[PDB]
């Protein structure tokens, strides 16, 4: 429970530098500012690597055999990792600012364009055990005059073309004999050279300029050496070539200019297959799949990434990250969608199961400050600094009503009624909670009673009451329904700045400015108790500071709280570099994550080695699947999850409860006993084994004989397995049997089976209803097409 691995990063699909494909082409590796994201394109998934870096990634290469990854930052620090286990094998330090990396197609060696030199290293082994010093130089060539701006291998690993800003294209070889064969230069060129590619037969050498010229060298005769055989010219007004890539086996040239235009040519005839513009910003990198059908175009200005299929003219993906900072977060009531809001107004809606961008909305002008949902999958309300608050559908994707005040005052915090009829927004320049009614649209009331701005609002969703916390050092619990309009003022010690209420709706945690997180009981307006936070916060030092990072109260508090959906944990995140996970009944922290190790961001270092983008966590929330929590911070929306389940967390073990005894019970055909043993052991492979092992005609008996201690766990397990399980008939038989056996127990402990029922009806609504929808559609279309009279 208390473990959380860094699982995912949403937003900022591509940040800086080389984008690559895989060997099989089913995966695209893209650089984000510190890490490397793997987009799986066949099965529609995303992943992010867990190792950080020291500064921004500048270059990436994957091995041909899909085994190693080298990733070089801006300072030679190069982390070399394995894939199929996903661990850092080594990290070396090439001291000079490395420009590009490439693996030879044999995989034995890799070239490294660094400075103006060309370095060539051998590669360490993967099946070999971890060595101390595995790196070894192989060759260093220094025949340029300026920096190497592009690198290319031959199809055999013998020749290397280095392209440099000395207007030069150089053929080196990896061997001395073939160096004597061709250690050859290529001059006679315009402004810069941006690429040099061998043809498939390797008798032709194409070079692509920055000016817009392609020169086809070919080893021909006039005792003869490398005449310029042909010249082709692109033609743009001012657009210079910024990125080139030539797939040789299908003779495809893909060029990307500085005006967002990319062109696809077939090279030897030099025909323009197509020409499309991605935007007003320069296309920064191009990669090609091995089969040539897929192309990847990364533009690092807006952080947008396109993956194209030029065969059928089909966009496999066209995402674009947020620009400024994900200012706010809101999950869905089931967890499939996660919506975010930037400092720009672009409100995006991501899907989680495939970590992608389903939609966007640009109807705001200035920064969106908060985004919330209702207790229904339909509506999503969003409040910005614009002076308005809008209401989005998520089935038709359209506004209903842009509520506002009268004087266009800037709303910070938002809260919604549980039934979805009242929308409250709390500004900062008015300290009056405005309250609109949804279906009418005009504002109901201006709840006054604070002194100084309302800092957070929320609705406890059973009693449907609202807490309002403000910089009057107060909380104020309003009840607004039923003739009363009554107020409960609670004082605190300092300025409050974050709030959350229990899923049961009895208590309120409020994080104040001193760093204590208090927890109040509503019905008594009393204090259940507080947890200190001023110690376990890892603040960073700034490079422009005049004090220490210990005696600085710059980020010594928590500006964001959220509960668990068991009411037992609290995530807290502020402007600091830490995300703290506390446990409430014992009042002690369970975990502390460091958000990012990046010396480029400001608040990372504790003591510097003897304006800029500060790192700060905007908003943290949990997931209604209760297996994950998301943190909207300045790099993106980080997602921590417990889908690993690599942990031996047992539950009431005994001496005879072994996996061998469980399989022995399976042979014994004691299916209830085997299931109870498996849930005692709590090992998910064993649980899957027995759960799929037991047959149909005893499912009702086993479901009636399952004890109430194990009922919530088997419910959660069947839910989170049935989501990504193709045995929908089996899962629905199991859910029906459990609901037939024990329904009153769940009605009486509805709070306890909260996440279980959330995930299970998420499964049914999401994957079962569409299937029976298509079944019904085909049935009625058949009935119509056969029953009625024919044409003519």
């Amino acid at each position: 429970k208390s473990d959380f691995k860094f699982s995912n990063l949403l937003g900022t699909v591509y940040r800086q530098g080389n984008i690559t494909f895989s060997d099989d082409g089913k995966q695209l590796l893209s650089p984000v500012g510190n890490r490397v994201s793997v987009f799986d394109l066949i099965n529609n998934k995303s992943f992010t690597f867990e190792y950080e870096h020291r500064k921004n990634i500048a270059a990436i290469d994957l091995n041909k055999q899909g085994t190693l990854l080298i990733s070089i930052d801006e300072d030679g620090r190069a982390i070399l990792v394995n894939f199929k286990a996903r661990n850092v094998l080594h990290h070396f330090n090439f001291k000079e600012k490395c420009s590009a990396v490439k693996f030879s197609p044999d995989g034995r060696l890799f070239a490294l364009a660094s400075g103006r030199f060309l370095q060539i290293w051998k590669t360490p082994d993967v099946n070999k055990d971890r060595q101390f010093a595995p790196f070894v130089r192989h060759r260093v060539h220094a025949g340029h005059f300026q920096d190497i701006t592009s690198l290319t291998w031959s199809q055999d690993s013998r020749f290397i073309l280095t392209t440099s800003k000395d207007l030069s294209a150089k053929i080196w070889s990896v061997d001395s004999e073939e160096k004597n064969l061709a250690a050859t230069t290529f001059n006679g060129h315009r402004d810069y050279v941006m690429g040099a590619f061998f043809s498939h037969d390797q008798e032709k050498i194409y070079t692509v300029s920055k000016d817009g010229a392609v020169f086809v060298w070919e080893f021909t005769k006039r005792k003869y050496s490398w005449r310029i055989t042909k010249k082709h010219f692109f033609y743009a007004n001012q657009a210079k070539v910024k990125c080139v890539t030539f797939h040789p086996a299908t003779r495809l040239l893909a060029v990307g200019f500085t005006s967002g235009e990319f062109r696809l040519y077939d090279l030897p005839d030099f025909t323009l297959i197509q020409q499309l513009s991605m935007g007003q910003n320069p296309v920064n990198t191009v990669s090609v799949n091995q089969t040539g059908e897929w192309l990847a175009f990364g533009s690092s200005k807006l952080g947008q990434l396109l993956v194209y299929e030029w065969q059928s003219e089909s966009y496999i993906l066209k995402q674009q990250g947020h620009f400024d900072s994900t200012n706010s977060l809101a999950y869905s009531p089931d967890g499939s969608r996660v919506v975010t809001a930037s400092e720009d107004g672009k409100i995006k809606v991501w899907d989680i199961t495939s970590g992608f961008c389903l939609a966007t909305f640009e109807e705001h002008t200035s920064s969106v400050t908060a985004v919330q949902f209702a207790k229904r999958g339909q509506v999503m309300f969003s409040s910005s600094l614009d002076g308005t608050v809008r209401a989005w559908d998520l089935i038709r994707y359209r506004n209903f009503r842009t509520f506002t005040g009268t004087e266009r005052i800037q709303f910070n915090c938002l809260a919604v009624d549980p039934s979805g009829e009242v929308v409250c927004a709390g500004s900062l320049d008015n300290f009056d909670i405005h309250v609109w009614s949804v279906q009418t649209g005009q504002l109901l009331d201006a709840l006054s009673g604070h002194e100084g701005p309302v800092s957070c609002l929320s609705f406890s969703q059973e009693n449907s009451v609202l807490a309002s916390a403000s910089w009057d050092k107060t909380i104020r619990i309003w009840s607004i329904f039923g003739r009363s309009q009554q107020v409960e003022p609670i004082e605190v010690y300092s300025d409050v700045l974050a709030l959350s209420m229990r899923p049961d709706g009895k208590e309120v945690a409020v994080s104040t400015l001193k760093g204590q997180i208090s927890i109040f009981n509503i019905e008594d307006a009393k204090q259940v108790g507080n947890i200190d936070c001023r110690k376990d916060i890892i603040s960073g030092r700034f490079n422009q500071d005049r004090f220490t990072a210990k005696n600085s109260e710059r980020s010594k508090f928590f500006t964001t709280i959220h509960y668990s959906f068991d009411g037992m944990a609290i995530v807290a995140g502020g402007n600091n570099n830490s995300i703290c996970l506390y446990d409430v009944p014992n009042e002690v922290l369970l975990k502390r994550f460091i958000v990012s190790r990046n010396m480029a961001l400001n608040g990372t270092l504790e003591f510097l080695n003897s304006m800029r983008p500060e790192v700060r966590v905007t908003s943290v929330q949990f997931s209604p699947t209760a297996n994950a929590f998301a943190a909207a911070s300045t790099e993106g929306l980080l997602i921590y999850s417990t889908n690993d389940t690599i942990l031996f967390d047992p539950f009431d073990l005994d001496v005879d409860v072994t996996p061998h005894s469980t399989v022995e019970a399976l042979r014994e055909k004691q299916f209830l006993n085997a299931l109870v043993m498996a849930f005692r052991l709590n090992e998910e492979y064993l649980i899957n084994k027995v759960y799929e092992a037991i047959p149909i005609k005893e499912i009702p008996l086993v479901a009636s004989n399952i004890p109430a201690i194990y009922l919530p766990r088997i419910l959660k397990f069947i839910g989170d397995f049935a989501i990504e399980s193709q045995h929908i008939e089996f899962n629905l038989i199991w859910i029906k049997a459990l609901l037939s056996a024990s329904g009153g127990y769940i009605n009486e402990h509805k709070y306890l089976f909260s996440t279980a029922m959330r995930s299970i009806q998420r499964f049914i609504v999401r994957v079962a209803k569409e299937v029976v929808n298509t079944t019904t559609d085909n049935k009625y279309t058949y009935r119509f097409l056969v029953s009625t009279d024919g044409s003519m």
Partner: protein
């Protein structure tokens, strides 16, 4: 370069490649010549934008709505304190008005620090804050509501000696 004399002055009366900038730097203690250039360039953008919005036809709903949007934004910024006119937008916006909306001038205005450079030094050492978070740069045009909520950071020695002189320290708040 040498305080060249009369006849050479008449021959080369324009060769000097080496004072409102230094004037405002003396009287309101701005940091940089480039800081003054920034504020003056900003007022230049306001002037050019004003001429262009006048060039747009005056009986235009788009023109009037964008104009009142800019007016309300500048009033929220608080460099001006009225709302009713546009001549105050074409003349009343000054380098002196924006430099008085700057942070240490506001601290001296609220009498926190006795002198402007002392306000600068306190902002350097990190003894002030604005609302929740604290501020370290002096070049910080404080908004209206936030200058309403500016104060010292807590548990700082300056607030400690404030409450000690008033003889009202309260170490439950560790003031």
């Amino acid at each position: 370069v040498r305080k060249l004399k009369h006849h050479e002055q008449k021959l080369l009366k324009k060769v000097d490649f080496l004072h409102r900038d230094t004037q405002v730097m003396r009287t309101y203690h701005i940091q940089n010549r480039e800081d003054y250039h920034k504020y003056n360039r900003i007022c230049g953008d306001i002037r050019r934008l004003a001429n262009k919005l006048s060039l747009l036809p005056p009986t235009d709903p788009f023109r009037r709505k964008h104009e009142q949007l800019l007016l309300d934004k500048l009033y929220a910024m608080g460099v001006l304190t009225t709302k009713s006119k546009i001549s105050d937008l074409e003349n009343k916006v000054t380098v002196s008005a924006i430099c008085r909306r700057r942070l240490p001038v506001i601290m001296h205005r609220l009498k926190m620090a006795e002198t402007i450079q002392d306000a600068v030094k306190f902002i350097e050492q990190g003894h002030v804050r604005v609302g929740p978070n604290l501020i370290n740069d002096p070049a910080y045009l404080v908004t209206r509501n936030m200058e309403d909520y500016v104060t010292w950071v807590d548990n700082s020695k300056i607030k400690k000696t404030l409450l000690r002189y008033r003889n009202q320290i309260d170490d439950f708040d560790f003031s």
